Design a protein around this ligand. Structure first.
Ligand SMILES: Nc1nc2ccccc2[nH]1
Ligand SMILES: Nc1nc2ccccc2[nH]1
Ligand SMILES: Nc1nc2ccccc2[nH]1
Ligand SMILES: Nc1nc2ccccc2[nH]1
Ligand SMILES: [Ca+2]
Ligand SMILES: [Cl-]
Ligand SMILES: [Cl-]
Lengths: 58, 250
């Protein structure tokens, strides 16, 4: 997998590593799940999410 | 904003209103609790730098509902390459004097990594632009916050479809050339926000155009991806005396 195609499969940020290696990362206020691609909020108000809508579908 | 709709209260929670002596100046984007991104040109005619206020949680300008949070702007940081009265490098980083409190109505927009922004976000066709600017060319400004969805053009196609400053690599075009839908005066400095897999990111800053919703022309936005490292470095720096700071770019 490579970051220039389909975001490396990452939900957020992607780093290419020497070889056929890729690492996904998440923004502050999120952590990477064991799938190695998804980001989940670690705080009440993570950036880029709209609380009234997140609650409207919780 | 011309041809958009009211942003329902709390759905544009990163939107900032900048005031000078209580009067509407510009918009801006909150990116964490003490930092706001706006447009350099918003500050071309500031006389007393100590009367700039940032308001978060704002929606309807005719009433106070208690979700609003005002802060003094302690620093306006502008790149060395910006020249007053011109269009290129139209970006400013504003330090608030005290953090805002994150709430349902006050939330930062994510400042993305450069590669992610260049390789991924730059290809998301539509993004949202917002503000309390003019609802019409030569018309009154909005009392309620407006938002508009606009498509992004590759610069080659912007130049081909348009019919005066260049569109530099520090800019991009977005919107419509039929005169129906645009950002306008007063929206300057506000967010062009891009959704990707459930999260929103800052990709542009309301910057300039030929009038507002002028047929044959598109809106122009500062290409934030060019400034990510410049911004990140300034956010790790200690404050300096004096509100206006010019900082080397790159
Ligand atoms: N960091 C963190 N992640 C959480 C997920 C569910 C509830 C509380 C949590 N705190
Ligand atoms: N209130 C609260 N605290 C949280 C921490 C992590 C994820 C979600 C959360 N909601
Ligand atoms: N007001 C104002 N804004 C400026 C931006 C760059 C250099 C000088 C400036 N003066
Ligand atoms: N498209 C567009 N963006 C603008 C920002 C300030 C003034 C006029 C403008 N027209
Ligand atoms: Ca209000
Ligand atoms: Cl420093
Ligand atoms: Cl000063």
């Amino acid at each position: 997998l490579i970051c220039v195609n389909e975001n490396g499969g990452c939900e957020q940020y992607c780093s290419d590593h020497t070889g056929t290696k890729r690492s996904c990362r998440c923004h502050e206020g999120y952590s990477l799940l064991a799938d190695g691609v998804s980001c989940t909020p670690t705080v009440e108000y993570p950036c880029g999410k709209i609380p009234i809508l997140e609650k409207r579908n919780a | 904003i011309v041809g958009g709709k009211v942003c329902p209260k709390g759905e544009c929670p990163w939107q900032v209103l900048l005031l000078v002596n209580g009067a509407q100046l510009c918009g801006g984007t909150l990116i964490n609790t003490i930092w706001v991104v706006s447009a350099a040109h918003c500050f071309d005619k500031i006389k007393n730098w100590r009367n700039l206020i940032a308001v978060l949680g704002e929606h309807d300008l005719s009433e106070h509902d208690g979700d609003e949070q005002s802060r003094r702007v302690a620093q306006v940081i502008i790149p060395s390459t910006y020249v007053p009265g011109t269009t290129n490098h139209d970006i400013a980083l504003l330090r608030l004097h005290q953090p805002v409190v994150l709430t349902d109505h006050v939330v930062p927009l994510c400042l993305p990594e450069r590669t992610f922004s260049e390789r991924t976000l730059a290809f998301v066709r539509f993004s949202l632009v917002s503000g309390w600017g003019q609802l019409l060319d030569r018309g009154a400004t909005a009392l309620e916050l407006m938002v508009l969805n606009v498509p992004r053009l590759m610069t080659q196609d912007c130049l081909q479809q348009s019919r005066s400053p260049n569109i530099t690599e520090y800019m991009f075009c977005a919107g419509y050339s039929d005169g129906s839908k645009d950002s306008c005066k007063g929206d300057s400095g506000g967010p062009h926000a891009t959704h990707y897999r459930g999260t929103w990111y800052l990709t542009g800053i309301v910057s300039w155009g030929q009038g507002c919703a002028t047929v044959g022309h598109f809106g122009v936005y500062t290409r934030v991806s060019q400034y990510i490292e410049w911004l990140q470095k300034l956010m790790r720096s200690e404050p300096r005396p004096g509100v206006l700071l010019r900082a080397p770019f790159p």
